[PDB]
Amino acid sequence: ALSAQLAKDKVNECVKAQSKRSGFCGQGTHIVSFVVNAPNGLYFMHVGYY
Amino acid sequence: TGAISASIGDIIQRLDVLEQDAQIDRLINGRLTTLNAFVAQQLVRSESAALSAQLAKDKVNECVKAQSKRSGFCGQGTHIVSFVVNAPNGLYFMHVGYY
Amino acid sequence: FDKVTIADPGYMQGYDDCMQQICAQYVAGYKVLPPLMDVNM
Amino acid sequence: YVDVGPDSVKSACIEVDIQQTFFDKTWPRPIDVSKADGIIYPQGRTYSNITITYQGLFPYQGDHGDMYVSAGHATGTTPQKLFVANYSQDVKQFANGFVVRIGAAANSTGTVIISPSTSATIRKIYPAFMLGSSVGNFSDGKMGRFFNHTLVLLPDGCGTLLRAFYCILEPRSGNHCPAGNSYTSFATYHTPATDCSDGNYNRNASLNSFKEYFNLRNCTFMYTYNITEDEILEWFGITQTAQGVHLFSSRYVDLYGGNMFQFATLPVYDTIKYYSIIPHSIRSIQSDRKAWAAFYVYKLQPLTFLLDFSVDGYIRRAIDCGFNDLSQLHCSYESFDVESGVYSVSSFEAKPSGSVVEQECDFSPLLSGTPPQVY
Amino acid sequence: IQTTIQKVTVDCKQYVCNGFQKCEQLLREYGQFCSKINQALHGANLRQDD
Amino acid sequence: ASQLGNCVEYSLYGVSGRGVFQNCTAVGVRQQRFVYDAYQNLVGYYSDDGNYYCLRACVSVPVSVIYDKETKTHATLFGSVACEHISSTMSQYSSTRSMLKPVGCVLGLVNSSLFVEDCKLPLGQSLCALPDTPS
Amino acid sequence: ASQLGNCVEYSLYGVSGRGVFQNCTAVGVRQQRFVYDAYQNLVGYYSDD
């Protein structure tokens, strides 16, 4: 349940919203993220800059 | 609730003093075992409560203080104001959400 | 605080409030401690 | 059996005078756990500098205990009657044994009891006991007769030997004598002008003054212990288990510190339950009377102390966990030091009163009818 | 947000032994456990106050 | 002999317990000498020939002590107990105690404590709900 | 059986076990001749006169 709360925040912080943050987003500057389901949870594909 | 658990195995009325020590030893062992269990559970609940206390502090300084201006669920829809009141051993939050 | 059902422990009266008739004083082991702060504060 | 010298030749006893009021005095020196007074170290094994909690036979803190006390009555040139309190009538139980404080009034100016206006400097004395398992009464009727073999412990030699022995007591039929007449209380004496002479301390005075009153038969064992003369506070203690009857002293190991260590186990296998003290007095002349420190008796019972051991391993501090709520806090945490705060302690429960209980040979046939004949 | 849990301290040797001397002796055989229980509860309450 | 002792000690036909008997109302068939309440412990009405003695168990006074190591000063506190429900060295009660040792009635009776006048920083050992008991 | 071996097993009056010995400077009451430490086990002393 705690990590599910983290999942809700992750989708709002990285996927639905943009970056402009240095902690809850993909390595380097964060450009976009995608989600797909996975066994027992979600799966995150943060896309960054380098 | 002891092999015989009659509120005191041989409270002062049953077989002999020598047997009394054995039954009371059995009853003591577990009375102490479930007291240790109680303590362990209290520790677990206290640590969870401390993590959530930190969460409530973050909530007071984030949603309540400045406008959240945050994508975070806080408020369901755009967040505008949020008020706090005391609740039984807890903090109750009343976010205002634009729809 | 009303619509919640808190049996209540009892401070400054709880022992006599229970003697006139929760078991914080009858089992004589578990004692609820007061919560560090007044409702007013 | 081993003989401890034959009987006496006297057929009459020295007159004994009872002055309980004179003996009674205000001298309150209770056992203190802080200074580790009346504390017995575990004799089988030793412990290090670590401070721990050790479960054993102790006297409980602040116990004022049981007190006893004076030179005999006399004339300027001749010693006469002896002043002794009526200790014979009172007999106390021996559930776990007792510890004795000895001569803490040393080196100070005191009050000569027999002449309450007169002062002298206090010098310590060594107490005697009788320990047995059966008690009765003398032929005069006074309570306190020791019947079964009795562990009668006796100092002597003006304080240079301790006599211990477990004999049958058969009293003597003279005047002032216990199975005799004019009896008030058994006692002892030594004659300082003849036996406390410097370099010539005689070693049969108190034995003589004990066999004046009783005749000992069938005695099983007896050991002697040289006693060095000083003015230093010391303790004694007697306990009993299945292993036998044990004795304890402060004289050998922590003489200047006051702890207590076993020195002799006597081979008694009778559960001692009763004991009485032996009253004693000094046969000095009126010009040469001195003061003689009151020795005190403190019971023992199973308890838990938190004991401090110094680096040398002597106990200089303790806690009686049973006395005061703070001591229970000191007993917990395995340390004297406890942090400032609010600590819940054991609650006080209600006391039972008037235990309640909930729960007709008809004479009607006798009441009705007409009586039949004797046949 | 839940925030805090109820603070309770349990008396030791009064819960386990109804108040009989025989039972108290058998317990002082074990008497370290009561001390640890009390220590733990006191520590938890102090931390809750903090 | 009378069932309504209203004192701690009591012994019933089949069970012996510490009670506080009182005249009460409307509970039980009366067929059974003792009436249970969903537990082995029994509310025990009906032992008297005809009376509602709804009983309780014994009542123990919670006690707590403040070491205050800095000043080495102790003041014992009684939990939610009344200012007058105890007496110094009470003979009514009987604990790991061979010896022990009305100003505060806001939380519980504090015997060896005093009373303050205004506000002292809530530091140090402190107390519960509101008192802060400075040394 | 004497002080020839310092490093391994020993066996005293009523107390036996394995140890390593040294002539440490001085700790204990020295009259009863075992020194424990807050536990069951012993710091040592008197495996000699």
Coordinates of N, CA, C and O in Angstrom, one line a residue, chain D residues 88-209:
Chain D
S88 N 16.1 -13.6 78.4 CA 15.7 -15.1 78.5 C 14.2 -15.3 78.1 O 14.0 -16.3 77.3
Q89 N 13.3 -14.4 78.5 CA 11.9 -14.6 78.2 C 11.6 -14.5 76.7 O 10.8 -15.3 76.2
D90 N 12.3 -13.6 76.0 CA 11.9 -13.3 74.6 C 12.8 -14.3 73.7 O 14.0 -14.2 73.8
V91 N 12.1 -15.1 72.9 CA 12.8 -16.0 71.9 C 12.3 -15.6 70.5 O 11.0 -15.5 70.4
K92 N 13.2 -15.5 69.5 CA 12.7 -15.0 68.2 C 12.9 -16.2 67.2 O 13.7 -17.1 67.4
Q93 N 12.1 -16.1 66.1 CA 12.2 -17.2 65.0 C 13.5 -17.0 64.2 O 14.0 -15.9 64.2
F94 N 13.9 -18.1 63.5 CA 15.1 -18.0 62.7 C 14.7 -18.5 61.3 O 15.2 -19.6 60.9
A95 N 13.9 -17.8 60.5 CA 13.5 -18.2 59.2 C 14.6 -18.3 58.2 O 14.7 -19.3 57.5
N96 N 15.4 -17.2 58.1 CA 16.5 -17.2 57.1 C 17.9 -16.8 57.8 O 18.8 -16.5 57.1
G97 N 17.9 -16.7 59.1 CA 19.1 -16.2 59.8 C 19.1 -14.7 60.1 O 18.2 -14.1 59.7
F98 N 20.2 -14.2 60.7 CA 20.3 -12.8 61.0 C 21.8 -12.3 60.9 O 22.7 -13.1 60.9
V99 N 21.9 -11.0 60.8 CA 23.3 -10.3 60.7 C 23.5 -9.5 62.0 O 22.5 -8.8 62.4
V100 N 24.7 -9.4 62.5 CA 24.9 -8.7 63.8 C 25.9 -7.5 63.6 O 27.0 -7.8 63.2
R101 N 25.5 -6.3 64.0 CA 26.4 -5.1 63.9 C 27.2 -5.2 65.3 O 26.6 -5.4 66.3
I102 N 28.5 -4.9 65.3 CA 29.3 -5.1 66.5 C 30.2 -3.9 66.7 O 31.2 -3.6 66.0
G103 N 29.9 -3.2 67.8 CA 30.8 -2.1 68.3 C 30.9 -0.9 67.4 O 32.1 -0.5 67.1
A104 N 29.8 -0.4 66.8 CA 29.9 0.8 66.0 C 30.1 2.0 67.0 O 30.4 3.1 66.5
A105 N 29.8 1.9 68.2 CA 30.0 2.9 69.2 C 31.4 3.1 69.7 O 31.7 3.7 70.7
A106 N 32.4 2.4 69.0 CA 33.7 2.4 69.5 C 34.4 3.7 69.5 O 33.9 4.7 68.9
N107 N 35.4 3.9 70.4 CA 36.3 5.0 70.3 C 35.5 6.3 70.7 O 36.1 7.4 70.5
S108 N 34.3 6.2 71.1 CA 33.6 7.4 71.6 C 33.3 7.3 73.1 O 33.3 6.3 73.7
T109 N 33.0 8.5 73.6 CA 32.6 8.6 75.0 C 31.1 8.3 75.2 O 30.3 8.8 74.5
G110 N 30.8 7.4 76.1 CA 29.5 6.9 76.3 C 28.9 7.2 77.6 O 29.4 8.0 78.4
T111 N 27.8 6.5 77.9 CA 27.1 6.5 79.2 C 27.2 5.2 79.9 O 26.8 4.2 79.4
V112 N 27.8 5.2 81.1 CA 27.8 4.0 81.9 C 26.4 3.7 82.4 O 25.9 4.4 83.2
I113 N 25.8 2.7 81.8 CA 24.3 2.4 82.0 C 24.0 2.2 83.5 O 23.0 2.8 84.0
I114 N 24.8 1.4 84.2 CA 24.5 1.1 85.6 C 24.5 2.3 86.5 O 23.9 2.4 87.5
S115 N 25.3 3.3 86.1 CA 25.4 4.6 86.8 C 25.0 5.7 85.8 O 25.9 6.4 85.3
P116 N 23.7 5.9 85.4 CA 23.4 6.7 84.3 C 23.9 8.1 84.2 O 24.0 8.7 83.2
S117 N 24.4 8.6 85.4 CA 25.0 9.9 85.4 C 26.5 9.8 85.0 O 27.1 10.9 84.8
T118 N 27.1 8.7 84.9 CA 28.5 8.5 84.8 C 28.9 8.2 83.3 O 28.3 7.4 82.7
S119 N 30.0 8.8 82.8 CA 30.5 8.6 81.5 C 31.8 7.8 81.5 O 32.5 7.8 82.4
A120 N 32.0 7.2 80.4 CA 33.2 6.5 80.1 C 33.3 6.2 78.6 O 32.3 6.4 77.9
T121 N 34.5 5.9 78.1 CA 34.7 5.7 76.7 C 34.3 4.3 76.3 O 34.5 3.3 77.1
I122 N 33.7 4.2 75.1 CA 33.0 2.9 74.7 C 34.0 2.0 74.1 O 34.9 2.4 73.3
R123 N 33.9 0.7 74.5 CA 34.8 -0.3 74.0 C 33.9 -1.5 73.6 O 32.9 -1.8 74.3
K124 N 34.3 -2.2 72.5 CA 33.3 -3.2 71.9 C 33.4 -4.5 72.6 O 34.4 -4.9 73.3
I125 N 32.3 -5.3 72.5 CA 32.1 -6.5 73.2 C 31.6 -7.6 72.2 O 31.1 -7.2 71.1
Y126 N 31.8 -8.8 72.5 CA 31.3 -9.8 71.5 C 30.1 -10.6 72.0 O 30.1 -11.1 73.2
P127 N 29.1 -10.7 71.2 CA 27.8 -11.3 71.7 C 27.8 -12.8 71.6 O 28.4 -13.4 70.8
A128 N 26.9 -13.4 72.4 CA 26.7 -14.8 72.4 C 25.2 -15.1 72.0 O 24.4 -14.2 72.2
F129 N 25.0 -16.3 71.5 CA 23.7 -16.7 71.1 C 23.4 -18.1 71.6 O 24.4 -18.8 71.9
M130 N 22.2 -18.6 71.5 CA 21.8 -20.0 71.6 C 20.9 -20.2 70.4 O 19.8 -19.6 70.3
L131 N 21.2 -21.2 69.6 CA 20.3 -21.5 68.5 C 19.9 -23.0 68.6 O 20.7 -23.9 68.6
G132 N 18.5 -23.2 68.6 CA 18.0 -24.5 68.7 C 16.7 -24.6 67.9 O 16.3 -23.6 67.3
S133 N 16.1 -25.8 67.9 CA 14.9 -26.1 67.2 C 13.7 -26.3 68.1 O 12.6 -26.4 67.7
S134 N 13.9 -26.3 69.5 CA 12.8 -26.5 70.4 C 13.0 -25.5 71.6 O 14.1 -25.2 72.0
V135 N 11.9 -25.0 72.1 CA 11.9 -24.0 73.1 C 10.8 -24.5 74.2 O 9.8 -25.1 73.9
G136 N 11.1 -24.1 75.4 CA 10.2 -24.3 76.5 C 10.4 -23.3 77.6 O 10.6 -22.2 77.4
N137 N 10.2 -23.8 78.9 CA 10.2 -22.9 80.0 C 11.0 -23.6 81.2 O 11.0 -24.8 81.4
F138 N 11.6 -22.7 82.0 CA 12.4 -23.2 83.2 C 11.4 -23.6 84.3 O 10.2 -23.3 84.3
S139 N 12.0 -24.2 85.3 CA 11.3 -24.7 86.5 C 10.6 -23.6 87.3 O 9.6 -23.8 87.9
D140 N 11.2 -22.4 87.2 CA 10.5 -21.2 87.7 C 9.3 -20.8 86.9 O 8.4 -20.1 87.4
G141 N 9.1 -21.3 85.7 CA 8.0 -21.0 84.8 C 8.3 -20.1 83.7 O 7.5 -19.9 82.8
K142 N 9.5 -19.3 83.8 CA 9.8 -18.4 82.7 C 9.9 -19.0 81.4 O 10.6 -20.0 81.2
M143 N 9.3 -18.4 80.4 CA 9.4 -18.9 79.0 C 10.9 -18.7 78.5 O 11.6 -17.8 78.9
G144 N 11.3 -19.6 77.6 CA 12.5 -19.5 77.0 C 13.6 -20.6 77.3 O 14.7 -20.3 77.4
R145 N 13.2 -21.8 77.5 CA 14.1 -22.9 77.8 C 14.5 -23.6 76.5 O 13.7 -24.0 75.7
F146 N 15.9 -23.7 76.3 CA 16.4 -24.3 75.2 C 16.6 -25.8 75.5 O 17.2 -26.2 76.5
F147 N 15.9 -26.7 74.7 CA 15.9 -28.1 75.0 C 16.7 -29.0 74.1 O 17.7 -29.7 74.6
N148 N 16.4 -29.0 72.8 CA 17.2 -29.9 71.9 C 18.6 -29.4 71.7 O 18.9 -28.3 72.2
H149 N 19.5 -30.2 71.1 CA 20.9 -29.7 71.0 C 20.9 -28.3 70.5 O 20.2 -28.0 69.5
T150 N 21.7 -27.4 71.2 CA 21.6 -26.0 70.8 C 23.0 -25.5 70.3 O 24.0 -25.7 71.0
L151 N 22.9 -24.8 69.1 CA 24.2 -24.2 68.6 C 24.5 -22.9 69.4 O 24.0 -21.8 69.0
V152 N 25.2 -23.1 70.5 CA 25.4 -22.0 71.5 C 26.8 -21.4 71.1 O 27.8 -22.1 71.3
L153 N 26.8 -20.2 70.7 CA 28.0 -19.6 70.1 C 28.5 -18.6 71.2 O 27.7 -17.7 71.7
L154 N 29.7 -18.7 71.6 CA 30.2 -18.0 72.8 C 31.6 -17.3 72.6 O 32.6 -18.0 72.3
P155 N 31.7 -16.0 72.7 CA 33.0 -15.4 72.7 C 33.5 -15.4 74.2 O 32.8 -15.5 75.1
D156 N 34.8 -15.2 74.3 CA 35.5 -15.4 75.6 C 36.9 -14.7 75.5 O 37.2 -14.1 74.5
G157 N 37.7 -15.0 76.5 CA 39.1 -14.5 76.5 C 39.2 -13.0 76.5 O 40.2 -12.5 75.9
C158 N 38.3 -12.3 77.1 CA 38.2 -10.8 77.0 C 38.2 -10.4 75.5 O 38.7 -9.4 75.1
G159 N 37.6 -11.3 74.7 CA 37.5 -11.0 73.2 C 38.7 -11.5 72.4 O 39.1 -10.7 71.5
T160 N 39.2 -12.7 72.7 CA 40.2 -13.2 71.9 C 39.9 -14.6 71.4 O 40.8 -15.3 70.8
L161 N 38.8 -15.2 71.6 CA 38.4 -16.4 71.0 C 36.9 -16.5 70.9 O 36.1 -15.9 71.7
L162 N 36.4 -17.2 69.9 CA 34.9 -17.5 69.7 C 34.7 -19.0 69.8 O 35.3 -19.7 69.1
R163 N 33.9 -19.4 70.8 CA 33.6 -20.8 71.0 C 32.2 -21.1 70.4 O 31.2 -20.4 70.7
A164 N 32.2 -22.1 69.6 CA 30.9 -22.5 69.0 C 30.8 -24.0 69.2 O 31.8 -24.8 69.2
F165 N 29.6 -24.5 69.5 CA 29.3 -25.8 70.1 C 27.8 -26.1 70.1 O 27.0 -25.2 70.2
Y166 N 27.5 -27.4 70.0 CA 26.1 -27.8 69.7 C 25.8 -28.9 70.7 O 25.9 -30.1 70.3
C167 N 25.3 -28.6 71.9 CA 25.3 -29.5 73.0 C 23.9 -29.6 73.6 O 23.0 -28.9 73.2
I168 N 23.7 -30.6 74.5 CA 22.5 -30.7 75.3 C 22.7 -29.8 76.5 O 23.7 -29.7 77.1
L169 N 21.6 -29.1 76.8 CA 21.5 -28.1 77.9 C 20.8 -28.8 79.1 O 19.7 -29.2 79.0
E170 N 21.5 -29.0 80.2 CA 20.9 -29.5 81.4 C 21.2 -28.5 82.6 O 22.4 -28.5 83.1
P171 N 20.3 -27.7 83.0 CA 20.5 -26.7 84.0 C 20.9 -27.2 85.4 O 20.9 -28.4 85.6
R172 N 21.2 -26.3 86.2 CA 21.8 -26.5 87.5 C 20.9 -26.0 88.7 O 20.2 -25.0 88.5
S173 N 20.9 -26.7 89.8 CA 19.9 -26.6 90.8 C 20.2 -25.7 92.0 O 19.6 -25.8 93.0
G174 N 21.2 -24.7 91.8 CA 21.5 -23.8 92.8 C 20.7 -22.6 92.9 O 19.7 -22.4 92.2
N175 N 21.0 -21.7 93.9 CA 20.4 -20.4 94.0 C 20.8 -19.5 92.8 O 21.9 -19.5 92.4
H176 N 19.8 -18.8 92.3 CA 19.9 -18.0 91.1 C 20.1 -18.8 89.8 O 20.3 -18.2 88.8
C177 N 20.1 -20.1 89.9 CA 20.4 -21.0 88.9 C 19.1 -21.5 88.2 O 18.0 -21.6 88.8
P178 N 19.2 -21.8 86.9 CA 18.0 -21.9 86.0 C 17.0 -23.0 86.4 O 15.8 -22.7 86.5
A179 N 17.5 -24.2 86.6 CA 16.6 -25.2 87.2 C 16.7 -25.2 88.7 O 16.2 -26.1 89.4
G180 N 17.4 -24.2 89.2 CA 17.5 -24.0 90.7 C 16.6 -22.9 91.1 O 15.6 -22.6 90.5
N181 N 16.9 -22.3 92.3 CA 16.0 -21.4 92.9 C 16.6 -20.0 92.9 O 17.8 -19.8 92.5
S182 N 15.8 -19.0 93.2 CA 16.2 -17.6 93.2 C 16.6 -17.2 91.8 O 17.4 -16.3 91.6
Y183 N 16.0 -17.9 90.8 CA 16.4 -17.6 89.4 C 15.6 -16.4 88.8 O 14.4 -16.3 89.0
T184 N 16.3 -15.6 88.0 CA 15.7 -14.6 87.2 C 16.1 -14.7 85.8 O 15.2 -14.5 84.9
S185 N 17.3 -14.9 85.4 CA 17.8 -14.9 84.1 C 19.2 -15.5 84.0 O 20.0 -15.2 84.9
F186 N 19.5 -16.3 83.0 CA 20.8 -16.8 82.9 C 21.7 -15.7 82.4 O 21.2 -14.7 81.9
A187 N 23.0 -15.8 82.6 CA 23.9 -14.7 82.3 C 25.3 -15.3 82.2 O 25.5 -16.5 82.3
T188 N 26.3 -14.4 82.0 CA 27.7 -14.8 81.9 C 28.5 -13.6 82.5 O 28.0 -12.5 82.8
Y189 N 29.7 -13.9 82.9 CA 30.6 -12.8 83.3 C 32.1 -13.2 83.0 O 32.4 -14.4 82.9
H190 N 32.9 -12.2 82.9 CA 34.4 -12.4 83.0 C 34.9 -11.4 84.0 O 34.3 -10.3 84.2
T191 N 36.1 -11.6 84.5 CA 36.6 -10.9 85.7 C 37.8 -10.1 85.2 O 39.0 -10.5 85.2
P192 N 37.6 -8.8 84.7 CA 38.7 -8.1 84.0 C 39.9 -7.9 84.8 O 41.0 -8.1 84.2
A193 N 39.8 -7.6 86.1 CA 41.0 -7.4 86.9 C 41.9 -8.6 87.0 O 43.0 -8.5 87.4
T194 N 41.4 -9.8 86.6 CA 42.1 -11.0 86.7 C 42.4 -11.7 85.4 O 43.3 -12.5 85.3
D195 N 41.6 -11.4 84.4 CA 41.7 -12.1 83.1 C 41.8 -11.2 81.9 O 42.1 -11.7 80.8
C196 N 41.7 -9.9 82.0 CA 42.0 -9.0 80.9 C 43.3 -8.3 81.0 O 43.6 -7.3 80.4
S197 N 44.1 -8.9 81.9 CA 45.5 -8.4 82.2 C 46.4 -8.5 80.9 O 46.4 -9.5 80.3
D198 N 47.1 -7.4 80.6 CA 47.7 -7.2 79.4 C 48.8 -8.3 79.1 O 49.7 -8.4 79.9
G199 N 48.6 -9.0 78.0 CA 49.5 -10.1 77.7 C 49.1 -11.4 78.4 O 49.8 -12.4 78.1
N200 N 48.1 -11.4 79.2 CA 47.8 -12.6 80.0 C 46.3 -12.8 79.9 O 45.6 -13.0 81.0
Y201 N 45.7 -12.7 78.8 CA 44.2 -12.8 78.6 C 43.8 -14.3 78.8 O 44.3 -15.2 78.0
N202 N 43.0 -14.6 79.8 CA 42.7 -16.0 80.1 C 41.5 -16.4 79.3 O 40.6 -15.7 79.0
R203 N 41.5 -17.7 78.9 CA 40.6 -18.2 77.8 C 39.5 -19.1 78.3 O 39.0 -19.9 77.6
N204 N 39.1 -19.1 79.6 CA 38.0 -19.9 80.1 C 37.0 -19.1 80.9 O 36.1 -19.8 81.5
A205 N 37.0 -17.8 80.9 CA 36.1 -17.0 81.7 C 34.6 -17.2 81.3 O 33.8 -17.6 82.2
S206 N 34.3 -17.0 80.1 CA 32.9 -17.1 79.7 C 32.4 -18.6 79.6 O 31.3 -18.9 79.9
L207 N 33.3 -19.5 79.3 CA 33.0 -20.9 79.4 C 32.6 -21.2 80.9 O 31.6 -21.9 81.1
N208 N 33.4 -20.8 81.8 CA 33.0 -21.0 83.2 C 31.7 -20.4 83.5 O 30.8 -21.0 84.2
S209 N 31.5 -19.1 83.1 CA 30.2 -18.4 83.5 C 29.0 -19.0 82.7 O 27.9 -18.6 83.0

